[PDB]
Write a protein that binds this DNA or RNA. Structure first.
Length: 149
RNA sequence: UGGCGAGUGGGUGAGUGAGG
DNA sequence: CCTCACTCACCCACTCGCCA
């Protein structure tokens, strides 16, 4: 069907440091009203931000009755999580290959739920490689990290 | 048996801090 | 783009420990 391209990014200043500040960015295009850069609530990490930037884009897509999404992110962790690992985790009790608990289980659960009824082409952006959509999403993510949660 | 911690080797990609 | 110091967490092995 007709697909729509969206660029997502999760960022986190001071990732792994004493005062991390995580933000999500979702870019639909120049001057698109759904473009957002907002603060990530909860645990402040880059991995959570990258997951919930994709979450936000999908929820926004649903509010527009869009069920075919070309979703760009630079997070292979998010992409491989949602297209591969989640199926294994629902079957094995959300255990990593080291036999440990999946740290961001509740975020992958939430994302897994949002992909229901969606046809999503998950795309890795090569990360700093001329894709202005990625740069615009990154900029919005940084803006959101400055805001309050 | 059931949990947990710390490492080593390899891999996938990200997010940073101080600088210039 | 460069240097120096790092975390985020998955894919796969392997080694050492701690609990009951």
């Amino acid at each position: 069907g007709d697909f729509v391209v969206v660029y997502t990014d999760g960022c986190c200043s001071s990732n792994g440091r004493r005062r991390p500040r995580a933000g999500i960015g979702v870019y639909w295009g120049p001057g698109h009203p759904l473009n957002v850069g907002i603060r990530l609530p909860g645990r402040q990490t880059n991995q959570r931000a990258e997951i919930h930037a994709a979450c936000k884009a999908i929820e926004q897509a649903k509010t527009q009755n869009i069920n075919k999404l070309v979703l760009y992110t630079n997070s292979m962790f998010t992409i491989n999580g949602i297209t591969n690992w989640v199926q294994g985790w629902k079957k094995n009790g959300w255990k990593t290959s080291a036999g440990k608990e999946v740290i961001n289980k509740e975020d992958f659960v939430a994302l897994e739920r949002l992909t229901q009824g969606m046809d999503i082409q998950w795309m890795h952006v090569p990360g700093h490689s001329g894709f202005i959509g990625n740069e615009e999403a990154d900029r919005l993510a940084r803006e959101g990290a400055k805001q309050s949660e």
